[PDB]
Amino acid sequence: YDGTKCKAAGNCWEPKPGFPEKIAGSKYDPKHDPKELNKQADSIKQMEERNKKRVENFKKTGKFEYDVAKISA
Amino acid sequence: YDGTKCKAAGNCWEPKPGFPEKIAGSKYDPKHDPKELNKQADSIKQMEERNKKRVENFKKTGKFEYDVAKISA
Amino acid sequence: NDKLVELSKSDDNWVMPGKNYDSNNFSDLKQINKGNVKQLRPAWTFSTGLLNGHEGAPLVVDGKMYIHTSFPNNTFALGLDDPGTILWQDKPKQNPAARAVACCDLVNRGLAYWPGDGKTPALILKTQLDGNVAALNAETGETVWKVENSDIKVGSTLTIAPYVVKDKVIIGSSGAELGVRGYLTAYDVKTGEQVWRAYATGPDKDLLLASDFNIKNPHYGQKGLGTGTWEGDAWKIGGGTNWGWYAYDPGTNLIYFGTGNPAPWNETMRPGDNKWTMTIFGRDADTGEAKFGYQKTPHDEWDYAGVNVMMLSEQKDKDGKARKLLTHPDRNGIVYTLDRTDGALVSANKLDDTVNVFKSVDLKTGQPVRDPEYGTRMDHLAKDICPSAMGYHNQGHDSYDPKRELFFMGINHICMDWEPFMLPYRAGQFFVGATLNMYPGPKGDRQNYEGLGQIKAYNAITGDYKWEKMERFAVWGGTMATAGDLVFYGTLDGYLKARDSDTGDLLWKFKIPSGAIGYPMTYTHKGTQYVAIYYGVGGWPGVGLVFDLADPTAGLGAVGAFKKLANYTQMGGGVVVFSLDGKGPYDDPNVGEWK
Amino acid sequence: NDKLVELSKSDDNWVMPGKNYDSNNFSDLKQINKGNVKQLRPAWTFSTGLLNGHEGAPLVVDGKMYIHTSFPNNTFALGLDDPGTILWQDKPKQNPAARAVACCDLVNRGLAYWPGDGKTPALILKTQLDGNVAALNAETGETVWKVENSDIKVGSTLTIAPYVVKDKVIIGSSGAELGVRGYLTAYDVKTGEQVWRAYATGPDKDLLLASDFNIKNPHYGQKGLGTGTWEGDAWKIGGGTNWGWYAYDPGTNLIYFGTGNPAPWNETMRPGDNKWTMTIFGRDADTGEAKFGYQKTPHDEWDYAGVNVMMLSEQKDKDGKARKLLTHPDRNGIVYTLDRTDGALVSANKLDDTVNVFKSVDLKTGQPVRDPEYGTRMDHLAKDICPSAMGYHNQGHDSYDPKRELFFMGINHICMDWEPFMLPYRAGQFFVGATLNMYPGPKGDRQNYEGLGQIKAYNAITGDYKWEKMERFAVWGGTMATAGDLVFYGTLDGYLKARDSDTGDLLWKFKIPSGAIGYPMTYTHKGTQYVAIYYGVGGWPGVGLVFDLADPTAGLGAVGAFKKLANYTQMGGGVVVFSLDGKGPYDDPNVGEWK
C-alpha cells in the first residue's frame, strides 16, 4: 500500500499485507452499536430545534431569550 | 468606660452602661465547653512529640524522616 | 464584509483573526524596524485572571482592545487611552463538564468583529468551550443572541475563533478524538439564524457540494466519496472537525479552510480513504457549497489533522502566469500551494528534509507517495515516524511578506513511535485507540529533549527556504511580519522574539511571564506603533505542565516530548504590549489617577 | 546573625524580609533617582503559575532570586544571569482542607535565608499554609528538615514569613478568627529542634516573661495579666496570633513584633483588657523571654489586630536625647514610637485626623482615651467607626529614610458599621461573631466607592506629616525608599508608582498585570540596579474578586468596600523586574538560546 493504486478517482486505499479488504466479520471488526452511532445526529437535531424557537422569538419580540422554557410569552 | 479608670496597673476595663462585671450566669454567658477549649493544647502537645521523634532521628541518622511511622529503622 | 475590508486597511485596527481576508498577519507599519527593535520595551500589561493556554491574539477596533481567555472564556474590553480601566467584561456561566471532553487544553483561538449596519450595533462574536456561540454588543458587552452549536454530551466542544464574512458568522467544530463527525455552520450575524451547515463525511447532500464540485480536477474525486471511501456507517463518527483558521477571497466568494483527522486514530478500524477528512475546501460564503476539495492525507494513520492556516497570495508561477494562490503548511510535513480559483495543485514541498512518512506528493495524480515503513497498523509498533501526530506544523497562524514573497512559518521538530489498540465507541467518551511516544526530530537533542522547533522563510513557487533557524521548543503560536524587515513570534519558553526577515538573525527578545501559544499583532494608537502578545503557556505542548501529568505517554504522547518545558516556564495568562522605549498611555503618570 | 548583618550591607543582596534587621526597606542605591525614573522599564518577567494574592517580596542572594507564591506555596530559584532557566523548584504536597481555615486569602509573606556554617549548607526557610515549616538547601532546593508548627484541624495555619536571627528561625502564627491562642516559636535553624515557644495569653509560665519584665514601665502591667484580664478559661481561645513582621537589634538581642486581636470579635463575650493580645513585645532572641510588653488596644472591640510592621531608627527626641527607637503604625489608627531598649512611650500620633475611636493616647498612663460613641457592644449597631477592622494600616511593610528621618507609610482610608452576635466556639470552625459594613473614609468618595487609601511621609518625633497623598484604593503592600529621592510602592489597581521623597509628587508609574499586595525591593546585579515587585491581587481586600463573592457583608465586610476593584484588575501571579531603559540579561539576545 503506497497510495498509488487507485480503484477510482480519489479512492486509492489498499489493505496492508496480511490485512483484509473488509474488516466486518474479521478479528478487527469494530462491532459498532448503531444506537451509539446515531447519538450525534439526534443532538444536532435537538439543538437546531431549540435554536429555531430562540431565533423566531427574537425576531418577533426584539428581545433574545436563550431559555426555551421561558419562551412563548 | 473610657479606659481611664484602672483597678490595677494594666487592668483598666470597666463594663459598659447596662452591662455586668461578670457575664457568667448572665444573658451573654458564652457557656463554653471545656472539652472544646482544651483541643488546642492537645494538638500542640501531639505535634511537639511528633517533631521530637523527627529531630532525634535526624540527629542520630543524618537523614531527615518526616514520616514518624517510618522512624526507628 | 466590505466594511471589514475597509477597516482592515487602517493600521489603527486589527479587526479579525489573521488581520485581513488574505490572512497575511503582515503590517505595513515600519515605525519599529530592524534599526531600532533593540529599543522595544513593555508599555503596559494586563492579567486575564485565568491560567491555562492563551491562544489567538487580541482585536483592536475603534480605540479599544478586546481580550479573550481560556475556559470559561471571559471577554474584556479596554480603552486604549486608559487601559487600566476595564470598560466591560463578559464572564460566561458554563457547565464544568465541558472540561472533561477537551482533548487538549481549555484553549480558545479568538474573537471576531462585525461592524454593524443601521439597526444592529457592532458586535463581538465569540465561541465557548461548552458549544455556545454568542454575539455581544461591542460597546456595552451585553449579549445580543446566543445559540447552541455543539453538544459536550457527545464530546463536541468549541475552541475555534468565529469568522465574519458579509453578514454571516462561520463556526467550526472540535471533537474528532471523541469521534465527532465534523461540520461547519454559517449563522446570520444579526439574529443567530442558521443559514447553512456542511459536514465533512457522509452523503453528498450532507457534504453540501456544488453541482460543479472539483470540475477542474475531477481526479481529486467528486461524488459519493463521503460514504464510498468508508466501510459501512463508520463515517457517522468519522471525525473531520475544523478547529483551525480560514481565509476568504471576496473575488471568488469562497472561504478556504481544512478539515481535521478521521476517527479513531486506530487506522485498522476504518479502512478507506476516509474522505473529506484531511481536505482543503473552498466553500461558497453564502450557500456553503463546496467548489473544490483536495484531500491531502488519504486514510490518515498519524493524526495529521488537516486544519492548519491558509495564507493567500498572488505570485507568478514557473511559467510566468500570475496566479491567485493559497499556501498551507500541514501537519503531515508538506506545505501545499494551490490555485485558489479552481484548486489546482501548484506546489507541495516538504517542511523539512527529515519528513519520511511520504516519499513525495505526485503533482499530477495529487496522491502522496507513502513510505510503507513509516505507516501505522494494528499489532505493530511503528518507530521513528516524522512528523509526529503533533505535526511539523500545528495550529500556529503564520505570516507572509508580499514584498518579499516569503512565508515565515513556525515549525515543530518532533517525531514518534506509535502502536494502535482496539476500543469501542461510546458517545461522550474518548475514541483515540493509539499509544504514542514523542521526542525531538533528527536535528534536535534527543537525549536532553530540547531542539523541538524551527522558524523558516519559504518561497512557495521555487520551494526554496531563504533561511532556517532552530528553536529550543516547537514554534507553536505562529508568526507576524512587518514592513520594518522584522518577523515577530512568541516561544513556549517565554519570549517574544524579532528576527531579520532577510537573514533570520535574532535581533531582539523579551522575557515575558509564560510561554506564548498565540501570535503577535500590531497597531497604532495615536501615532505610536504597539506590538501585543498573549502569555500563558498551554495547549497540547503544555498539557503535562498544565495538568501536572508525569507519564510520558499521557496527554496523547505530548508529556514525554515536552518533559523539559517546566524548567523554563510556569502557567500564566495575560497580555504584554510593547512599543519603542515603552512609551504609552501613562507617560503622563496622572492619567488614570483617582481625583 | 552576623553573617546576615554583613550580607545585608551589600547592595547586590536583599537577604531577609524588610532588607535589614532595622527593617528599613531603604536602599542607598541611587542609580535610579528622581532625575531619571521616567526611563524605568521592565527588563524581564516571570509568572508563578498560581493565582491568589502574592504578598511579600523576593530574596536575592549570591546572584540568585528566590520566589515564593500563594498556596500551595511553591518556591523557585532563578539565576540572575539567565532568569529564563528555573534552577530548582519546590512544590509542596499539602492537604486541601488547609484552604477552608484561612480567614483571608491563601497568601504567604515570604522567605528567609540562613548563610550556613561549615557542615550545614545555606538554607531557604519557608512556611506553608498547612502549618509546616521547612528548610531547603539554597543551591539544590532539597528539603533538609520539616516540622509541624500549626494544626489546621483546630484552625491554625501559617501565612507569616520566617525570620532568621543568629542560628534560630522564628515562626509566628495565624488563626485568631478561629479562636486560636497565639504563640511564636524559635527552632534551631540546623535541625528543626524547638528551642522556645511563647504564648500571647494565659499563665505567666506560658507567657515566658523575663524576671525584669516591664521593669521600667510597671504601669503597663506586669505579672498575672494573661489570665487576670480575662474571665475564666476564655484566654484558652483568646487570639493574639502574630502573623506580621519583626525587627531585631543585635545590641539589645531583642526581637520586636506585635500580637494580634483577641477572639471572638464579639467584645461582650470576653470582658477584660484581654492581655497580651494587641501588644508590642520585645523578646530575647535566645530564650524568648519578654523584656517589655506594651498593650496598644486594651479590650479590642474592632479587630485592630496589632501585628503591623516594626521599623527601627535612632533619632534625637524633643529633649535632644539620642534614642534607639521603634516606630509602628497600628490598625487602630495610631502610629507608636517607643524606646526600643525599655519600651518607654515616645510618641503615639494619629495616622489621619479622621480616627475617632480614641480621642487620644495618654503618654503618661499609656492608656488610649476611648470615645464611647464609637465602641462596639452586643445588641447595638455601631456606625461610622474609623478605622474599620481593616485598619488605617494593615500588613504592609513600610520604609524609613535615615537621612530624612521620614517614614513613608501605605495607609488605608476605610471606616465601618459593626454589630456583634452570639456564637459558640467549636474547634476548627470560625469564631468571629460580628457583621460588618465597610466603606471609604470621610476623605474618600463614599458614593462611588473610591478613595480608599493614602500614602504619607511622617516624622516620629515631631509627629508632623511632610506630605500626604490620596490613592484610589488602600495602599496595602508597603513601601520602599531609596537614596535616589524616590519612594516606590505597588497599588491594588495594578501599578508600581514612584513618588518624590520630599514632596510626594507622582513622578512615574507602570501598569503591571494585577494589583500589588507585596512591597518593592531593589538590588544590583552586575552594575545595574533593578527594582522588583510581585503582581497578583488578593489578600483581604481582594477576597471578593478572588472568591467571586457578591454580598457586601461577605469576606468579613471587605466585599462591599472593594466592590470597584474588579473594574481595574483581575487576579494574577508573578514578578516584574524593572531597570533604566529595561536593560537586562537578554540585551544580548543570544543568551539563553538553545544551541
Ligand SMILES: O=C(O)c1cc(C(=O)O)c2c(n1)C(=O)C(=O)c1cc(C(=O)O)[nH]c1-2
Ligand atoms: O480533532 C479535534 O477536534 C481537535 C481539536 C483540537 C482543539 O480543539 O483544540 C486540537 C486537535 N484536534 C489536535 O489534533 C491538536 O493538534 C491540537 C492542538 C491544539 C492546541 O490548542 O494546541 N488543539 C488541538
Ligand SMILES: O=C(O)c1cc(C(=O)O)c2c(n1)C(=O)C(=O)c1cc(C(=O)O)[nH]c1-2
Ligand atoms: O487573626 C489572624 O490570625 C489573622 C491572620 C491573617 C493572615 O494570616 O493572613 C490576617 C488577619 N488576621 C487579619 O485581621 C487581616 O487583617 C489580614 C489581612 C491579611 C492579608 O493577607 O491581606 N491577612 C490577615
Ligand SMILES: [Ca+2]
Ligand atoms: Ca485531533
Ligand SMILES: [Ca+2]
Ligand atoms: Ca485577625
